[PDB]
Design a binder for this molecule. Structure first.
Ligand SMILES: [Zn+2]
Lengths: 122, 55, 58, 193, 267, 137, 157
């Protein structure tokens, strides 16, 4: 629940950067009918950027309190039922993937046959 | 007949590679217009979660 | 053209001939350093000999 | 179809025609050219003004009818038969048949043809033809042709054929090579020796 | 024309430099003779320093005269608006140029279909500029687009695009036949020339290079701009080996974002 | 008269520029002094065979200028060895070489390695000189 | 030059005079003051660095014997390579002003004798040091030592 929060904070960081770049691009695209439309789009983008900043602050505040163990200690140099349950999902997913393989190779053969037959109908 | 054979083996080798090793991903897309003598593919190797950075 | 020198390298599925590829690799990768060594010498800067640093690769 | 340059190589103050020809072919083979066949070019003149009828082995189904400054026809092989039908308005003007013979080399989209010119039984000149393939606009590629000619000839390099003189954006066609050949033939038949 | 603005700015800079040079000359001469340790260096240093200032003044006057030979012939609140507008477009223009290079995104995901008239009008909008380029569109088979682009008296390009995404390109010369016996476009054929095959390979690499993730119009615009440079072919030599011909081939490589000729062997 | 000698003794101290790059590449192993000196003394012997009475000294003078002109002292030590078994066989008199070595103006006390090596070499061949030469030395 | 010859003539005809500075000041201070106003308000470091930047195959240090804290220093070397056997220490002497010159190796012939392997090492050593160019460094010589030992070991087996 906390690693997901860290990943969400990271993702929001990339969205913040992307939104800043998009804001600068949109300001560049403005050349003096549709001007009010661009202005409303700019207002929407700025307000959602502010909401994104608020969400990032909330995530940081939540994750800051919850370090006892430092870095560079856990790097390995040269010198219980969860596993049981996980396996079934892996096997089931693998089986599903295998089934998709049969459908895919069949559809591609069908399209190859129709291409070959239709190419020379003239 | 030759071209059909060769195309089917190329497809089978790409797909066996895709199914046997998962350290880098490998992905193929076939074309859409095709002839009785030629064909084409695009093959693309990317990591599982970094498709935008390393391509 | 001319000819200036000749040296023979030491002698020491299976259709790839890996040794010739390895010789071309090292020769192309390493010949850039010779001109820079000669130029740092030519402008009178004290350097050390060109050498492998740390790990073997670079 | 591509841009073509036709010139005459002098006999080089000694020896015979065969020696100069074999020197040129040895240089061409040293550069990296390869044999791909042979060729022949002929010409005949007709009079009652002068008309010229020419054939080329490069275009095996064509006949070229030329004036000194007038138009130029590209007909099929039957045209000469029509001349045989006239026989009362245009004499054949005997003792004016001339031919060039030789072999053709190709070196990476270039065509080089070095030939000997014969007044029937007697040979008295050498002709050199260089043709580029992918370029159709006259003088657009004139630099590549000059560089290649300087590559295998050194001195005696020609320049700026007079047919190029129509400084427009016109497309070079196969009828201009025949004008160049006619001019070269006239020059050789004028100088003699 | 905007060259007059730069000429006037350079004249202002030149006159300011002239005034500063005169002031520097007179101040340096007023300072007087220094020590410079030994006597011999003391003698030479003053003369060397004095000559340079006068030489600079003469050079500045000469270049100013060269420019003189070169040169030739409620409202306030309105102007305050104008001088602001041009201050915005430039300000973002740099900011968009520095953020696109350093892209921080890692994946498009979180945690295609277009009308034919859209593609047709986009291709026409590409066609309106570059007068030498001429583009013809057709759809013999399905919704896939087949475009014939003629360049000068040199190039003929056949492009097959799948829903505005460029997919396949084959180029040929001018005199070569591009249509089939039936009269339709010939898709599967070869140019019968080594240089044209090499530039087909180059075009394939180029189309594999220009790949935007969510703007598809800029991709075809960049491809057309790159293809535009090939009109100058056979008239420009390589930037490394000087000569046109290497192994019998003219320069056939145009570098991306810096459109200059190059041989394939010269990279 | 000196170009051939310079070439021979330049091949003596020959340095291959491309070396110090690609070590352990050339299959051939460089010749040792046991091998290197015999060939060099034979070449210098055939040079000495064709020289005249009045031209004996000048070439030797030149060669000392060549020996001290190098910058690596150990190469100078094997050049000293070249001279040492040049004078031992009786081909060269061990009186001209001593005066040629000591009289050189390139040798001062500033060059420590040259000083030590040259004086040791002079000590080696001092036993075969007439007493007049010893007095001059 | 142009437009300023009179100033050059005046300066040259006035120079090396005891009252030149007084003349210049008295003739050029007042206008400048009025127009603008008031005026403005042991072991050398090279050896230590090269020892710090050598491969950890070597642990060269000061010689316990001989002199120290001078321009000429003496070093003793030991080789610790898992892939190579043990060899004589191969001590070196470094003269003063080490840059722009070359160090010398003190040969010890009796140490390398009485064994075909060691004298093979020694003759390869002589060959390589004759192959080394001028103005060389000590790291190059140490690497030459390592490579000569490796080549001799390869030739032996
Ligand atoms: Zn080039």
């Amino acid at each position: 629940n906390t690693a997901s929060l860290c990943r969400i904070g990271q993702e929001t960081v990339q969205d913040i950067v992307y939104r800043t770049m998009e804001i600068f691009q949109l300001l560049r695209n403005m050349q003096l009918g549709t001007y009010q439309d661009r202005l409303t789009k700019l207002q929407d983008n700025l307000r959602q950027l502010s909401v994104l900043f608020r969400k990032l602050r909330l995530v940081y505040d939540k994750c800051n309190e919850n370090d006892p163990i430092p870095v560079e200690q856990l790097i390995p140099y040269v010198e219980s039922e969860e596993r049981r349950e996980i396996a079934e999902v892996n096997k089931k997913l693998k089986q599903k993937n295998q089934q998709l393989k049969q459908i895919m190779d069949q559809l591609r053969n069908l399209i190859w046959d129709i291409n070959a037959m239709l190419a020379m109908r003239n | 007949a030759k071209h059909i054979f060769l195309r089917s083996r190329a497809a089978a080798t790409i797909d066996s590679l895709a199914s046997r090793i998962e350290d880098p991903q490998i992905q193929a897309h076939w074309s859409n217009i095709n002839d009785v003598y030629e064909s084409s593919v695009k093959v693309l190797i990317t990591s599982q979660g970094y498709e935008q950075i390393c391509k | 053209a001319m000819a200036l020198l000749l040296q023979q390298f030491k002698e020491n599925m299976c259709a790839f001939n890996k040794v010739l590829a390895h010789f071309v690799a090292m020769c192309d990768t390493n010949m850039p350093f010779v001109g820079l060594r000669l130029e740092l010498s030519n402008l009178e800067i004290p350097h050390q000999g060109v050498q492998v640093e740390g790990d073997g690769f670079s | 179809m591509g841009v073509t340059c036709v010139s005459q190589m002098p006999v080089a103050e000694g020896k015979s025609v065969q020696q100069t020809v074999e020197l040129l072919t040895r240089k061409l083979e040293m550069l990296g050219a390869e044999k791909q066949g042979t060729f022949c070019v002929d010409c005949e003149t007709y009079h009652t003004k002068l008309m010229y009828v020419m054939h080329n082995s490069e275009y095996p189904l064509s006949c070229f009818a030329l004036f000194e400054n007038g138009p130029c026809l590209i007909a099929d092989t039957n045209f000469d038969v029509l001349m045989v039908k006239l026989k009362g308005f245009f004499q054949s003007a005997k003792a004016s048949k001339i031919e060039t013979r030789g072999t053709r080399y190709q070196y990476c989209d270039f065509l080089v043809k070095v030939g000997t010119v014969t007044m029937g039984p007697s040979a008295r000149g050498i002709s050199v033809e260089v043709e580029y393939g992918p370029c159709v606009v006259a003088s657009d590629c004139w630099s590549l042709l000059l560089e290649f000619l300087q590559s295998f000839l050194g001195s005696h390099t020609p320049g700026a054929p007079a047919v190029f003189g129509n400084r427009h954006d016109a497309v070079y066609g196969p009828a201009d090579t025949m004008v160049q050949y006619m001019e070269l033939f006239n020059k050789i038949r004028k100088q003699q020796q | 024309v905007s060259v007059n603005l730069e000429a006037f700015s350079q004249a202002i800079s030149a006159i300011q430099a002239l005034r500063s040079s005169v002031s520097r000359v007179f101040d340096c001469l007023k300072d007087g003779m220094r020590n410079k340790e030994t006597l011999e260096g003391r003698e030479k240093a003053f003369i060397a320093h004095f000559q340079d200032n006068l030489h600079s003044v003469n050079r500045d006057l000469n270049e100013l005269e060269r420019l003189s030979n070169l040169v030739g012939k409620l409202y306030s609140q309105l102007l305050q608006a104008y001088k602001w507008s041009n201050k915005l477009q430039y300000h973002a223009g740099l900011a968009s140029g520095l953020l696109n290079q350093q892209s921080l995104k890692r994946s498009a995901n979180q945690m295609l279909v277009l009308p034919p008239q859209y593609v047709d009008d986009v291709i026409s909008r590409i066609d309106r500029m570059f007068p030498e380029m001429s583009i013809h569109l057709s759809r013999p088979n399905g919704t896939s687009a087949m475009l014939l682009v003629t360049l000068g008296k040199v190039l003929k390009v056949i492009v097959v695009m799948r829903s505005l995404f460029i997919d396949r390109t084959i180029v040929k010369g001018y005199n070569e036949n591009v249509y089939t016996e039936d009269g339709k476009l010939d898709i599967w054929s070869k140019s019968n020339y080594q240089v044209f095959q090499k530039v087909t390979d180059h075009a394939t690499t180029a189309l594999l290079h220009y790949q935007l993730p969510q703007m598809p119009d800029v991709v075809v615009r960049s491809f057309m701009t790159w293809l535009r440079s090939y009109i100058k072919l056979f008239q420009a030599p390589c930037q490394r080996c000087g000569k046109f011909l290497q192994d019998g081939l003219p320069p056939t490589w145009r570098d991306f974002r810096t459109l200059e000729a190059f041989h394939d062997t010269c990279r | 008269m000196e170009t051939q000698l310079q070439s021979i003794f330049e091949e003596v101290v020959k340095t291959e520029v491309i070396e110090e790059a690609f070590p352990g590449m050339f299959m051939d192993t460089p010749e040792d002094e046991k091998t290197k000196l015999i060939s060099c003394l034979g070449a210098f012997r055939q040079f000495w065979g064709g020289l005249s009475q009045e031209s004996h000294e000048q070439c030797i003078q030149w060669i000392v200028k060549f020996i001290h002109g190098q910058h690596s002292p150990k190469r100078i030590s094997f050049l000293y060895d070249c001279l040492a078994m040049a004078v031992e066989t009786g081909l060269l008199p061990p009186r001209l070489v001593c005066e040629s070595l000591i009289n050189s103006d390139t040798l001062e006390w500033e060059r420590t390695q040259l000083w030590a090596l040259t004086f040791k070499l002079v000590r080696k061949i001092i036993g075969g000189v007439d007493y007049k030469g010893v007095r001059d030395l | 030059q142009y437009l300023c010859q009179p100033l050059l003539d005046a300066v040259l005809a006035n120079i090396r005079s005891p009252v030149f500075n007084h003349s210049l000041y008295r003739t050029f201070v007042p206008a400048m003051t009025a127009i603008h106003g008031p005026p403005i308000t042991s072991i050398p470091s090279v050896l230590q660095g090269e020892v710090a930047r050598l491969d950890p195959k070597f642990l060269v240090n000061l010689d316990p014997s001989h002199c120290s804290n001078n321009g000429t220093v003496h070093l003793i070397c030991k080789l610790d390579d898992k892939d190579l056997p043990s060899v004589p220490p191969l001590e070196l002497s470094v003269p003063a002003d080490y840059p722009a010159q070359s160090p010398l190796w003190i040969d010890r012939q009796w140490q390398y004798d009485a064994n075909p392997f060691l004298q093979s090492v020694h003759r390869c050593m002589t060959s390589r040091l004759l192959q080394l160019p001028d103005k060389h460094s000590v790291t190059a010589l140490l690497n030459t030592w390592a490579q000569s030992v490796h080549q001799a070991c390869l030739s032996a087996a």
